[PDB]
């Protein structure tokens, strides 16, 4: 049968809504989108050539176009280029420790591209922030959005910035003449979930 009046709505996954979004999140307040009930054609991504990083963990590109998953989650944010290496299982650094932490047993892909043309400004882009101070490291996929003043000394802060009392987020301040490692990179992390449940995300 061919029904046009009420068609089959299950089509290719809307990766464009994630990868080509105009607004991207700060890494401390990283964005998550749930992908479900669609066909995941990953070859639009695989052979795109526009990416600086395309690293897969526990899964292989070109094989992604096969097999099913329960759901896919897509996390997205901006970091500097020299921090992309921290978006990997088992890494350390300000980003992995205080902002976005992958689990050791991660199954998924980490994709990044240089966004200097969109995300830097002559006077500095102050919209993208990262967490610089935290009392302990994040657990995997933990997301800390606190703005509480960090007590860096023996004197209490009572909610006011001052000596040894720091606002915990700092701006990257991207400017277009930065060296490549200090330029902004947009990052998408695709995590593949497999439960004993109906699969809703399948390849073609």
């Amino acid at each position: 049968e061919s029904i046009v009046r009420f068609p089959n709505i299950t089509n290719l996954c809307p990766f464009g809504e994630v990868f080509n979004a105009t607004r991207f999140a700060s890494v401390y307040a990283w964005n998550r989108k749930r992908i479900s009930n669609c066909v995941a054609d990953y070859s639009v991504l695989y052979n795109s050539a526009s990416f600086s990083t395309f690293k897969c963990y526990g899964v292989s590109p070109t094989k992604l176009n096969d097999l099913c998953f329960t759901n896919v989650y897509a996390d997205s944010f901006v970091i500097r280029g020299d921090e992309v290496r921290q978006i990997a299982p088992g890494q350390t650094g300000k980003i992995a420790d205080y902002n976005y932490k992958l689990p050791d047993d991660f199954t998924g892909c980490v994709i990044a591209w240089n966004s200097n043309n969109l995300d830097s400004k002559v006077g500095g882009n102050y919209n993208y922030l990262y967490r610089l101070f935290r009392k302990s490291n994040l657990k995997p996929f933990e997301r800390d959005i606190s703005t509480e003043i960090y007590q860096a000394g023996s004197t209490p802060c009572n909610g006011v910035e001052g000596f040894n009392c720091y606002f915990p987020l700092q701006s990257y301040g991207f400017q277009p003449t930065n060296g490549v490692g200090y330029q902004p990179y947009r990052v998408v992390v695709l995590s593949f979930e497999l439960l004993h449940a109906p699969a809703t995300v399948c390849g073609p």
């Epitope: 307040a29 998550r32 749930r34 989650y73 996929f141 997301r143 959005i145 703005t147 509480e148 449940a197």
Partner: antibody, heavy 120, light 109 residues
């Protein structure tokens, strides 16, 4: 610390509208989703809906579509619940909470509640 | 959508006793389940998430278990601060993030 400070108790007549508020401190509401929950007297909790203050997007339980309108003011870090065409079934305590749907472990921070009483 | 029910509606137990309360989902929620405690006149507080993981600041005498559609909250060696109401809530798939009807735990004497 995180705090969700809700507006005070309301006593209103059937047919009226009321707008409740929740002012957050310790985080920016644009960085999460703000949810509202109803609890009728001696009754259970009911999820009303949520807003994403970063882009305005809302979702509601079908039973509250139209009755409830959730908005946010990021400049003052405040979320609002407007309830329209009030009836006695709307008498309840209303709570605001924070929950970033597919990330957070549960609804960790709640306001103190706002009592709404509808009566003639 | 998933509907949530709890049992018993009310239970009396003595300080020092152990109790088990139950949450049942209308369909399989794959451990995407939270428990809350609510004291009279206060807001709910998160106790357990992912069915079995205790939230920060919760005593280890609480334990969550279960699978599929049936979940349990066990309280070992009840203390006076434990009496109150308990609610479950699922986070499976998409909203609504529905709550169970609640269980009221009272003191037996």
């Amino acid at each position: 610390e995180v705090q969700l400070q809700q507006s005070g108790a309301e006593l209103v007549r059937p047919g009226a509208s009321v707008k409740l508020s929740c002012t957050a401190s310790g985080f920016n509401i644009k960085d999460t989703y703000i949810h509202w929950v109803k609890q009728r007297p001696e009754q259970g909790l009911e999820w009303i809906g949520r807003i994403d203050p970063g882009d305005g997007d809302t979702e509601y339980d079908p039973s509250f579509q139209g009755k409830a309108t959730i908005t946010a003011d990021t400049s003052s870090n405040t979320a609002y619940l407007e309830l329209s065409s009030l009836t006695s079934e709307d008498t309840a305590v209303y709570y605001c909470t924070r929950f970033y749907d597919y990330v957070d472990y549960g609804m960790d921070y709640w306001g103190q509640g706002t009592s709404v009483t509808v009566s003639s | 959508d998933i509907q949530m029910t709890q049992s018993p509606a009310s239970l009396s137990a003595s300080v020092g006793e152990t109790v088990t309360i139950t949450c049942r989902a209308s369909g399989n929620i794959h451990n995407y389940l939270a428990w809350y405690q609510q004291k009279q006149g206060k807001s709910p507080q998160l106790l357990v998430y992912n069915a079995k993981t205790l939230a920060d600041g919760v005593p280890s005498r609480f334990s969550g278990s279960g699978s599929g559609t049936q979940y349990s909250l066990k309280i070992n060696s009840l203390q006076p601060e434990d009496f109150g109401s308990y609610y479950c809530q699922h986070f499976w798939s998409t909203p609504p993030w529905t709550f169970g009807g609640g269980t009221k735990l009272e003191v037996k004497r």
